[PDB]
Design a protein around this nucleic acid. Structure first.
Length: 767
RNA sequence: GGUAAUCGCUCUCCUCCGGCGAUUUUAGUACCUGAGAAAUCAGAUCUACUAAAACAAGGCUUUAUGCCGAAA
DNA sequence: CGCCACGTCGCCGGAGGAGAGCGATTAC
DNA sequence: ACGTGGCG
C-alpha cells in the first residue's frame, strides 16, 4: 500500500544520501593522502571558479572547493523535464552547462531546475557527458598550466566520481551481509558466506506442473518446438488430420523455410487441393496469427553471415543460453554468466548475441509457463503420438493435487499484495478459533477459496458447503513513524521560545490564510516582518487595491507586471514571495540542536509531533492516586526484538507525572505500593466511571501537558468519535482529566467476543 | 460453468540504481538604519542569492562499489 | 481550564520480475 | 487522524 511505497522511497533516498557522504569522505581521504591539506576557508563563488579553471590556474583551495561541489551534482547518466532536456541539448551543441548556468546567473541570478518564464524551461538536470567533458577540460588546463596534479589523482578521482552500482547487485558487500542484495547472510555447512550472480534470478516463478522447478524462457529451442507442435497439431485440413510423418515433414520444411506461408507449404506436403480451412487464427483486424519459428529464422539469417551452425548446438546449451539472454541485460552480467557456463563461446558469438538481444528485445517477452523437465517429457511423446496438447497433459495426470501437506497436519498458504496477506491471516485465525470452540459444517479470492475448499475437503465425514475482520487487532511493534519530519527553526521573544513557520504567498489557500490573518489584526502584533517597517505597508497597499476573491499578487503581475520587491530608493530590493510568521510555544519536542554544533538542549532547532507507544496506569493502595504515565516512541531503543525502554528516559516521565521526586527512582516504588495495574497500547479497551455510569472506551494516547490526560475512542467504532450536531461529524477529542476519578479497567477481547479482566502485570522492559 | 496453452492490448504490486528539489543551522554579500561628504564602520541580522553541514531520535563492525534503522 | 481551528513533503527518469482484466481463439 | 498552542 502507500505505506510500503513510502518505506521504499525513504530506503532508496537514504541509500543514495549515504553513498554521497561516502563519496565525499573518500574524496577527502584522497586529498589527504596525495600530499595536500584540506583548507579551512571555503569559497562561495564556485561557478566563477569553474570559469577561471577552464583557462587559468587555480589554487589548491579553489580546486578542492570546485571538486567538492562537482561530486555532489554529478548529473544523470544513461513534461517540463523532457523539454528542459531538449533545451540543454540545443544549447550543449556549442558550450557546457557551466557557461549556461553563468548566463542564467547573469540575466536571472538563479540555477535550480524551476524556471517558468509563452514559457521557457531552462533547468539544471543535465547529462553526465557534459560534466565529464567539463572535467576533462579543467584537468587538462590545470595540468598544462603546471599544476601539482598527477595522473594517478585524476584517474582515481574519476573512479570515485563514476561510482554507480548496478541494479542487479543491490546493497551490502563481501563483508556486510544483508538479505537485501547479492551478498547474503545465509551460511552453508562449512560456515562460508553465500554469494549470488543476480538478484532477480531467485524471483522467477515456479513451473505450473512441477512446483519445484524454474520455468523456461519462451525464446529457446524446446519452447518453440513445443509451440509449433501445438499449433500445427490443432489444424485440420480437408477434413483430414495431419499424420505423424506429415508432422515431421512440415516441421522440417518450416524450420528450413525463410518465410512462412503455410497454405502453400501445407498443400505441398499434403499433395492434395484445399477446399476448407479450420484452426486458422486470422485476426478480424487483418493479421494471420501463426506460431512459426521466429527467433530461429532471425538467428539463422544473422549467424549464417559469420557461418556459425545453430544445428551444431546441443539442446541444453541452446536452452541455457536463451535463458541468460532472457534475464541478463548488461554486458558484465552476461559475460559472467557465460563464463559460469562451462561451454566455451567465441567472443564473436558473445558480441553477436548481445547485439541480437539489444536490437530485437521484443522477442524475449517473458518466460514460458512450463519448465524444461515437463517440456522434455512432452515433446518426444508429442512427436511420436499425434494427439492434442491438452489430452497429452492429462495422460500422466501429473496435475493430481497438492494436498499432501494439508493431510499431513498459514505459511503454506501465505507464501502462495501485502494487504490481503494480513486479511487472510486474520480470517484463518478466526476460523481456527471457531473450529476449536465449536462448528465444522480475483487472484487472491481464487487462491483463498481454493485453499479453504482443499482444507475442508481434507477432513473426514465432512459435508461443508462453501458457497461464495478488517484488521482491527492491536499494536505491539517498535520503530514506527517516530516524528513527522519537517525540521523547524525557532526563535525567542520576551523570554519565550516560539516555533516559526514560513507562509507561502503564491498559494491560493495560503493567500487566503494571510488575508484572514492580516484583516483580523493578528499579524502586525507579531515581531516577524516588523524588522522591516516600510516593507510591511506595501503588502497592505498591494492587497486592499486588488483584494477581490483571488490571489492579489497574481493580478499584480497581470496588470502592473512588476513583482513585489523590498523598499529601496534604488529599487534594488530582493523579491518577496514567502513571509515568515510566528506559530507558538513548544512543549513537546525532540532536542536536535546538538547535531548543529550548538549546546546540549539549547532548543535552537526542534522536531515536533512525537508519537505514542504505551501508557502504564499506576495505583497506590495508600490513597488510590492516579499516575497514567505515558510512553512515546522516542524513549524506545529497539530494533526488531529489543523493545527496551531502558532505566533512564523512564524515571523522568515517572517524575514529571508526579510519581517520584528528584531522589526517588524505579526501585523506590514498593514503599508507596506502586506497580502496574495495566499496560495499555494503541487500540486497546479501558473502563471508566464518569459520573458513576461505566463508560467502556478504547484508549488511544496521552496529549497536552495537563497531568492525567487520556484520549478515548468510542468502543463501538473509532470512525464515529462524536457526532455532535445535526449532520456534521466533528473529530471532537475526549481530552479528560483523570486527577479525581476512582476506577479503571481493561477488557482483553479476543475475536470470538470473550472479555478477560486483567490484573497486576509483570514489567515492561522486553528484551 | 471451471482448467491449460498462445497472441495482441490495458491496469496493479515487490525489489534495485540515480537526479532535481524542499526545510533548517552557521558564514558572506545585497536590502534597511545610524556615524560619515562619500568610502568605510558599527548595529539590525527582516527579505533573497551563494557555500557547507543536518535530513526519522539512534545504532553497528564489515573500515568500505560499508551496513541497519518509517508494515507481517 | 476548556474550547477549536491549524496544519502536516513533492516531482522526474531507467530497469527487472510477478499479478490480473479485455478481444480472438484451440481444446478438455 | 491526530498532535498541540492560544484565547476567551
Amino acid at each position: 500500500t502507500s505505506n510500503n511505497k513510502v518505506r521504499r522511497t525513504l530506503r532508496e533516498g537514504r541509500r543514495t544520501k549515504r553513498r554521497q557522504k561516502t563519496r565525499i569522505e573518500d574524496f577527502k581521504q584522497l586529498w589527504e593522502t596525495s600530499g595536500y591539506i584540506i583548507p579551512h576557508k571555503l569559497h562561495l563563488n564556485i561557478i566563477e571558479l569553474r570559469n577561471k579553471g577552464l583557462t587559468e590556474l587555480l589554487s589548491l583551495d579553489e580546486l578542492y572547493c570546485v571538486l567538492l561541489s562537482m561530486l555532489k551534482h554529478r548529473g544523470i547518466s544513461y513534461n517540463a523535464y523532457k523539454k528542459g532536456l531538449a533545451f540543454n541539448e540545443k544549447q550543449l551543441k556549442e558550450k557546457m552547462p557551466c557557461e549556461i548556468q553563468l548566463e542564467r546567473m547573469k540575466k536571472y541570478g538563479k540555477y535550480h531546475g524551476e524556471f517558468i518564464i509563452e514559457k521557457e524551461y531552462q533547468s539544471n538536470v543535465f547529462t553526465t557527458k557534459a560534466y565529464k567533458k567539463e572535467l576533462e577540460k579543467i584537468f587538462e588546463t590545470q595540468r598544462c598550466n603546471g599544476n601539482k596534479i598527477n595522473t594517478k589523482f585524476i584517474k582515481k578521482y574519476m573512479e570515485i566520481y563514476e561510482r554507480k552500482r548496478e541494479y542487479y547487485i543491490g546493497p551490502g558487500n563481501e563483508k556486510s551481509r544483508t538479505d537485501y542484495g547479492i551478498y547474503t547472510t545465509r551460511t552453508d555447512e562449512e560456515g562460508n558466506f553465500i554469494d549470488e550472480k543476480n538478484i532477480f534470478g531467485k524471483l522467477i516463478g515456479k513451473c505450473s506442473v512441477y512446483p519445484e522447478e524454474y520455468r523456461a524462457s519462451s525464446a529457446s529451442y524446446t519452447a518453440q518446438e513445443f509451440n509449433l507442435l501445438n499449433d500445427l497439431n490443432n489444424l485440420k485440413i480437408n477434413n483430414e488430420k495431419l499424420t505423424e510423418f506429415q508432422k515431421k515433414e512440415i516441421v522440417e520444411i518450416i524450420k528450413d523455410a525463410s518465410s512462412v506461408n503455410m497454405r502453400k507449404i501445407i498443400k505441398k506436403v499434403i499433395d492434395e487441393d484445399i477446399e476448407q480451412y479450420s484452426g486458422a487464427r486470422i485476426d478480424k483486424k487483418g493479421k494471420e496469427i501463426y506460431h512459426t519459428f521466429e527467433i530461429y529464422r532471425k538467428l539463422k539469417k544473422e549467424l549464417k553471415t559469420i557461418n556459425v551452425d545453430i544445428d551444431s548446438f546441443t539442446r541444453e546449451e541452446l536452452d541455457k543460453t536463451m535463458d541468460i539472454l532472457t534475464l541478463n541485460t548488461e554486458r558484465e552480467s552476461i559475460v559472467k554468466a557465460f563464463d559460469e557456463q562451462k561451454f566455451v563461446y567465441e567472443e564473436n558469438l558473445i558480441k553477436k548475441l548481445i547485439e541480437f538481444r539489444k536490437n530485437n528485445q521484443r522477442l524475449f517477452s517473458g518466460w514460458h509457463s512450463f519448465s524444461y523437465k515437463a517440456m522434455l517429457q512432452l515433446i518426444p511423446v508429442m512427436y511420436k503420438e499425434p494427439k492434442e496438447q491438452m489430452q497429452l497433459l492429462t495422460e500422466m495426470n501429473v496435475f493430481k493435487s497438492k494436498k499432501e501437506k494439508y493431510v499431513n497436519y498459514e505459511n503454506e498458504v501465505v507464501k502462495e499484495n501485502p494487504v490481503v496477506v494480513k486479511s487472510i491471516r486474520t480470517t484463518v485465525k478466526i476460523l481456527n478459533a471457531l473450529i476449536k470452540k465449536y462448528g465444522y459444517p480475483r487472484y487472491a479470492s481464487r487462491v483463498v477459496l481454493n485453499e479453504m475448499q482443499s482444507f475442508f475437503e481434507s477432513r473426514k465425514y465432512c459435508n461443508t458447503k462453501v458457497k461464495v475482520k478488517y484488521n482491527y487487532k492491536i499494536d505491539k511493534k517498535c520503530n514506527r513513524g517516530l516524528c513527522n519530519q519537517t525540521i523547524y527553526g525557532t526563535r525567542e521573544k520576551d523570554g519565550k521560545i516560539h516555533k516559526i513557520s514560513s507562509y507561502n504567498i503564491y498559494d491560493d489557500k495560503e493567500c487566503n490564510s494571510l488575508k484572514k490573518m492580516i484583516n483580523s489584526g493578528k499579524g502586525s502584533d507579531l515581531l516577524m516582518y516588523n524588522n522591516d517597517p516600510k516593507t510591511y505597508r506595501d503588502m497592505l497597499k498591494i492587497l486592499e487595491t486588488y483584494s477581490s476573491e483571488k490571489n492579489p499578487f497574481v493580478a499584480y503581475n497581470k496588470e502592473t507586471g512588476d513583482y513585489f520587491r523590498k523598499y529601496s530608493k534604488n529599487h534594488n530590493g530582493p523579491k518577496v514571495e514567502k513571509v515568515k510568521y510566528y506559530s507558538g510555544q513548544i512543549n513537546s519536542c525532540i532536542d536536535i540542536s546538538h547535531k548543529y554544533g550548538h549546546a546540549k538542549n539549547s532548543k535552537k532547532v526542534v522536531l515536533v509531533s512525537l508519537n505514542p507507544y504505551r501508557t502504564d496506569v499506576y495505583y497506590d493502595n495508600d490513597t488510590g492516586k492516579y499516575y497514567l504515565v505515558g510512553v512515546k516512541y522516542n524513549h524506545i531503543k529497539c530494533v526488531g526484538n529489543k523493545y527496551v525502554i531502558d532505566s533512564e528516559t523512564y524515571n523522568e516521565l515517572l517524575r514529571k507525572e508526579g510519581v517520584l521526586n528528584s531522589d526517588e527512582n524505579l526501585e523506590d516504588l514498593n514503599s508507596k505500593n506502586i506497580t502496574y495495574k495495566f499496560s495499555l497500547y494503541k487500540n486497546d479497551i479501558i473502563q471508566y466511571e464518569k459520573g458513576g455510569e461505566y463508560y467502556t472506551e478504547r484508549f488511544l494516547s496521552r496529549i497536552k501537558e495537563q497531568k492525567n490526560l487520556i484520549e478515548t475512542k468510542p468502543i463501538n467504532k473509532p470512525n464515529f468519535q462524536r457526532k455532535n450536531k445535526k449532520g456534521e461529524w466533528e473529530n471532537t477529542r475526549n481530552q479528560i482529566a483523570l486527577a479525581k476519578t476512582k476506577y479503571v479497567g481493561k477488557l482483553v477481547t479476543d475475536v470470538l467476543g470473550n472479555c478477560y479482566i486483567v490484573n497486576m502485570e509483570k514489567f515492561s522492559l522486553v528484551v
